[PDB]
Design a protein around this ligand. Structure first.
Ligand SMILES: Cc1cc2nc3c(=O)[nH]c(=O)nc-3n(C[C@H](O)[C@H](O)[C@H](O)COP(=O)(O)OP(=O)(O)OC[C@H]3O[C@@H](n4cnc5c(N)ncnc54)[C@H](O)[C@@H]3O)c2cc1C
Ligand SMILES: Cc1cc2nc3c(=O)[nH]c(=O)nc-3n(C[C@H](O)[C@H](O)[C@H](O)COP(=O)(O)OP(=O)(O)OC[C@H]3O[C@@H](n4cnc5c(N)ncnc54)[C@H](O)[C@@H]3O)c2cc1C
Lengths: 461, 460
């Protein structure tokens, strides 16, 4: 926390760095060191709030020369707590939030500290968009480096499936461009390989015209759980790419569109949208609303930016979280009953068991085309415990582990962006042998000293 | 657009500047110089995309020493076309988009090139908010400098009502902080005085906790205009601050919630929300949804970031715009009949005659407390023509001038942020005589040479 640093190397850093520094003595230190996973409480020796690529260069070099453990933070959403370290440096990108958008080229160049909401605002000024996650205050940086999925994915792929190049500052402090024609080995590995390979300071995306989106959300009783999940599973097997439909098993939020009788009870929250013409969307969405008896139905036609900003409306932002996730190739009747059993035990108002269906454009990309594993597994499940009181940490986490272990025979792989702080040992199984090996090769070449290790880490061969 | 420039001056600029420069022969020049108002087609000598306060200092100094006319651009939304110039320099702030939010202090610090949706995204990470306009790709910069109202304004006041300081780069190239206790004269004037005083590089705002908001939108046939508008004006006179309710007279959008038989027909779009508990919200909104026979009802409970991003679902972004706007102290029956007459002439899809009701927290601030005029006038009406084809410019433009002149007997003042490119002459009437005089005194102190004149200009 207060390590001795060489004064000369510190002075050099300072003259070269135009951003803001935050030291452990400063009034804003405790707030700046907080990340969205409030169970992570770590005290860096320094927070370096970078404002340009040269800033990031100066910070990487200063960390390398100084031997400080490097944490890189984009939006701070790491479910594993990777964006803050004890005793090291946080290379904080959050003030690097610029997006340039060319309407004529349908192209966006976004800085590596951008929030999704900032990105979506900029592109939707021209009615353009590309795929990213569903929660507006997520960081673009960590999400895209992991793959990145959300509302537009079945139609347009992962965020990485629309990435055309990056600017990246590597461990030696060099700046590189990686694309299909420049450093293509590196460009393959950052598309799903995390922060393993250097600090991405700029992402370039291809964009799509995305007009108003017919959206519906509704709640079903858990009593109809088997019928609704089976309807969903079967429907999605053959659904148009334009339909996206997610199920979130949760306590029903105390909202006026729901009967007060249902408040605080476990329910299925079904969220769905049609990426395409809204009169077609009305017809498609209507055909799936009656999976069970619907309650608290909201239907609306939203600009895409509002659909992005919609998840997940509540009075409280949860302080503490714990996730256990994996992919499924098939969702059997026995797996569904497991899901529903564990759902009924849910305790916190903020906890959910989510069941996502990917496939569509995501699956049509050849497996070896990026470092993202598991394109062929269309289902994702996430036991996302979330709560407030730290005295309850044991009970919440036990809930998520029990559900995972009960589902374990059905699960395969794992999305790097959904790993928790105790899942370092999941990296090889999540990527697979062929992928984990080619990633190690690229690690050996670009970060042979493993300067970047506060991520779902790939050690160099 | 290709002036002769001094090599020493230019070299000084280059050395001190760390942003991106765009010259006329660059491939991204034509796209960079386009602003929201597509009727404004202008060619600067230079576009300087600043990336920090010292960038802005360098660009201001350079423009002053070169005698380049200065345009300042935050989000490019100027209804008057002020953010681009022929032959000058555009100090383009769009890359200065960062926001720091303290949860513990309920405070944010936003750079001068931020977009509303970026600001709202950052503060809503902590369930916090402060009032701003209703379209997210609007620039925070020009919006706040002229006042700024939107959904949270009845409860929480104008954007400026929540501003506690600014960092500003003045015409002589100095950097200054202005607040209630530091250069308070300048702090009074930037709250409503536009970009007249320098380039704001950071805005600091107090925030409020804003959770899920109950929201409703519905359409009424224009036939029921007299009773709908009367219901609205009478109800807003005594409405809780928590309720915001606006009317948009327009051709009905081809949305699936509206019957096919109303598409493109003359309607009132009523948009409302309750800033407060959503169960109370459901009750209050139910009470106003039958002002006439409702059609195409949407009700949702939305995070505030989604309410902000909502205005408005449409598949085409309008290229050309022209606005005529005023305040009303009262909306009589004859004024009502006048607006309904002119709304029935709307014969194209993207134009709106908007009818807003402000008051609440906005009218509770003493009138001399900021440079924003017209706090005691609750109504704003905006004839907002919007269209695509340049050959139609004269027809749309005429529609809006005709409505404004028919209403002119009822109208007073004007919101600076709704002025068209031909309304330079309205500045005095907008502010009123006492404000405009206090404003010219501040202008003589901070911008005596009127370097910053591409705004609703206040000469010193
Ligand atoms: C509420 C919530 C909702 C989510 N929803 C979705 C979703 O819908 N879809 C989805 O795909 N994912 C989603 N996620 C998971 C998310 O993708 C990961 O948490 C992601 O890692 C967050 O990125 P970030 O920059 O905010 O996080 P950080 O904690 O800042 O960073 C995460 C990791 O990326 C590295 N990193 C970040 N930026 C850079 C950069 N510019 N260059 C190099 N390395 C970098 C960090 O070192 C760290 O290892 C969500 C997360 C949260 C908390
Ligand atoms: C679709 C749309 C919706 C709108 N809705 C609302 C609304 O709901 N409520 C509302 O109050 N207003 C609203 N407006 C009006 C808006 O407030 C003005 O158009 C505002 O001037 C736009 O700010 P800007 O930075 O985007 O524009 P710009 O064209 O970039 O700038 C406008 C003026 O501000 C100056 N300027 C901009 N940034 C700075 C800065 N950082 N420092 C100094 N000078 C600066 C410019 O020189 C120019 O004179 C809206 C505008 C549009 C186009």
């Amino acid at each position: 926390q207060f390590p001795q640093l060489d004064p000369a190397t510190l002075a050099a850093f300072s003259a070269a760095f135009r951003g803001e520094l935050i030291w452990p003595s400063d009034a804003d230190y405790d707030e700046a060191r907080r990340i969205w996973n409030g169970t992570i409480d770590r005290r860096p020796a320094l927070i370096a709030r970078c404002t340009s690529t040269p800033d990031v260069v100066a910070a990487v070099s200063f960390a390398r020369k100084s031997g400080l453990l490097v944490a890189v933070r984009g939006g701070g959403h790491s479910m594993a707590g990777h964006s803050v370290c004890d005793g090291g440096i946080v290379i904080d990108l959050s003030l690097m939030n610029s997006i340039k958008v060319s309407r004529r080229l349908r192209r966006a160049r976004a800085q590596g500290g951008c929030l999704l909401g900032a990105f979506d605002t900029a592109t939707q000024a021209h009615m353009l968009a590309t795929p990213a996650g569903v929660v507006s205050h997520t960081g673009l940086g960590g999400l895209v480096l992991g793959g990145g999925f959300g509302w537009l994915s079945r139609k347009y792929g992962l965020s990485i499936d629309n990435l055309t190049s990056v600017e990246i500052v590597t461990a030696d402090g060099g700046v590189l461009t990686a694309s299909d024609t420049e450093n293509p080995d590196l460009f393959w590995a950052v598309r799903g390989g995390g922060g393993n390979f250097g600090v991405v300071t700029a992402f370039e995306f291809d964009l799509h015209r995305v007009g108003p989106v017919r959206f519906a959300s509704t709640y079903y009783s858990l009593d109809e759980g088997p019928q609704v999940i089976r309807a969903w599973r079967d429907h999605m097997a053959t659904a148009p790419d334009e339909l996206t439909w997610a199920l979130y098993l949760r306590l029903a939020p105390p909202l006026p569109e729901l009967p007060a009788d249902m408040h605080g009870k476990p329910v299925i929250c079904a969220m769905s949208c049609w990426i395409g013409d809204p009169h077609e969307g009305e017809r498609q969405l209507e055909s799936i609303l009656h999976a069970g008896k619907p309650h608290g139905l909201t239907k609306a036609t939203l600009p895409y930016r509002a659909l992005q900003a919609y998840s997940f409306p509540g009075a409280v932002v949860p302080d503490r979280i714990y996730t256990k996730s994996g992919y499924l190739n098939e969702l059997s009747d026995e797996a569904t009953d497991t899901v529903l059993e564990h759902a009924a035990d849910i305790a916190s108002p903020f906890t959910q068991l989510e069941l996502l269906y990917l496939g569509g454009a995501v699956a049509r990309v050849p497996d070896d085309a990026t470092a993202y594993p598991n394109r062929q597994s269309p289902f994702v499940t996430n036991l996302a415990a979330a709560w407030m009181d730290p005295t309850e940490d044991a009970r919440h986490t036990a809930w998520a582990r029990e559900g995972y272990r009960a589902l374990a025979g059905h699960l395969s792989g794992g999305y790097v962006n959904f790993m928790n702080p105790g899942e370092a040992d999941r990296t090889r199984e999540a990527y697979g042998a062929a992928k984990f090996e080619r990633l190690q090769g690229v690690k050996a070449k670009y970060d042979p000293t493993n300067l970047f290790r506060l991520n779902q880490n790939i050690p160099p061969s």
